[PDB]
């Protein structure tokens, strides 16, 4: 009850007369909604997983995945997953979020160079054949391919680039086979100061595990920047307005009330923002309707007590909220503090500081004792 909350707040078993601040009431949501696009066709990860050949790192295969539903459960169906580590995104949470553009990249990497596929890594492979961005926000699955890409005579079909004037910027592809020049002497062919940049792995099945070939698939998804088209298989429910609910709009979680919008979104925009840079309006992916997002009512709670020695009666002041909203939330059992003060019609008073519940409003005027706010004071009188 509020008096016990005040006792906890003061860390004392006796409460002196006054008004104390205890906690912050909050209208808790009732339902939870999810709105996801109509797309149902499954993205074809197996095709880039059933790639009969893997391109060389210097010209690594790159494919885009979009306009489909992504089910990352098929990744676990693959057996080896030698290195399954996701940057910036929980591998378990992969099934719920929504990504705009998914980029899938595949290649065959050196056995001990797997750890070099990471932001800012040092080494030949890191900054001469394949460079990841420093702000990588995707996932990557690596596994050995010795029993698929090893020949007894040696695999010379795959190559890497080792000689070049400058290191490669992240996500840059170099395919030229021009000779390398050392110093200032011009180069016209194989010889001094001129070497072929491309060298072969020379993979052999007899080589050790650290020397074994390794197939790697890179799944780099860019985060929420509005035009989301690749979404998880989470089913969508009906939309409810004018009720504090937990929404999930295309991967944007939160809690607030939804209503029709008078703001006119232009066709390209997806969701609006506040001046303080908080999400304010969201366009419904299915019905293409623009809705506001207003957080459910809250505010501080102040307990007015005449002193625990005089009496145990208390009066609660719900700061900055109309009595209509507080009464509706109490009737719907939504307020976070669950010690509802008894209301008998005449125990509800609407001050400019908030809603006063538990105190009767008289028409008289005395030298006020307990200050509430905006010219209103409370006291214990017969």
């Amino acid at each position: 009850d509020p008096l016990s909350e005040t006792k906890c707040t003061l860390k004392s078993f006796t409460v002196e007369k006054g008004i104390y601040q205890t906690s912050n009431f909050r209208v808790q949501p009732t339902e939870s909604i999810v709105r996801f696009p109509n797309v149902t066709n499954l993205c074809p990860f197996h095709e880039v997983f059933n790639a009969t050949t893997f391109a060389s790192v210097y010209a690594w295969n790159r494919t885009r995945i979009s306009n489909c539903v992504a089910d990352y459960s098929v990744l676990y169906n693959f057996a080896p997953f030698f290195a399954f580590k996701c940057y910036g995104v929980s591998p378990t949470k992969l099934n719920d979020l929504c990504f705009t553009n998914v980029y899938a990249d595949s290649f065959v990497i050196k056995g001990n160079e797997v750890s070099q596929i990471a932001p800012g890594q040092t080494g030949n492979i890191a900054d001469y054949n394949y460079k990841l961005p420093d702000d990588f926000t995707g996932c990557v699955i690596a596994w050995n391919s010795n029993k698929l890409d090893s020949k007894h005579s040696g695999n010379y079909d795959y190559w890497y680039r080792s000689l070049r004037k400058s290191k490669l910027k992240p996500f840059e592809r170099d395919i030229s086979t021009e000779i390398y020049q050392a110093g200032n002497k011009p180069c016209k062919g194989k010889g001094p100061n001129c070497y072929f940049p491309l060298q072969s792995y020379g993979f052999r099945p007899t080589y050790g595990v650290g020397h074994q070939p390794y197939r790697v698939v890179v799944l780099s998804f860019e985060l929420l920047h509005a035009p989301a088209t690749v979404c998880g298989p989470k089913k969508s429910t009906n939309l409810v307005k004018n009720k504090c609910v937990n929404f999930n709009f295309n991967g944007l979680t939160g809690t607030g009330v939804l209503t029709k919008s008078n703001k006119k979104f232009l066709p390209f925009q997806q969701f609006g923002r506040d001046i303080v840079d908080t999400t304010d309006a969201v366009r419904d992916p299915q019905t293409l309707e623009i809705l506001d997002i207003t957080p459910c009512s809250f505010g501080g709670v102040s307990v007015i007590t005449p002193g625990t020695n005089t009496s145990n009666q208390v009066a609660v002041l719900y700061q900055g909220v109309n009595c209509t909203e507080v009464s509706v939330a109490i009737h719907a059992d939504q307020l976070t503090p669950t010690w509802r003060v008894y209301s008998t019609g005449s125990n509800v008073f609407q001050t400019r500081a908030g809603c006063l519940i538990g105190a009767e409003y008289v028409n008289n005027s005395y030298e006020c004792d307990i200050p509430i706010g905006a010219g209103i004071c409370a006291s214990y009188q017969t």
């Binding site: 601040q21 912050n24 909050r26 939160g254 501080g300 700061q319 200050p371």
Partner: protein, 49 residues
């Protein structure tokens, strides 16, 4: 006198987040102090007027 402002920590720092709220208790009383200071300032404003 000046405007009396009261600020709620948990809503400002970890607004509607059980995990962040639990992680906030590890910082001791860095919020009872803020609430006490702001309440004292507000009472002082009323006393000034």
């Amino acid at each position: 006198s000046m405007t009396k402002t009261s600020v709620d920590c948990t809503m400002y720092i970890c607004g509607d987040s059980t995990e962040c709220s639990n992680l906030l208790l590890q910082y001791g009383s860095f919020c009872t102090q803020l609430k006490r200071a702001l309440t004292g300032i507000a009472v002082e404003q009323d006393k000034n007027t």
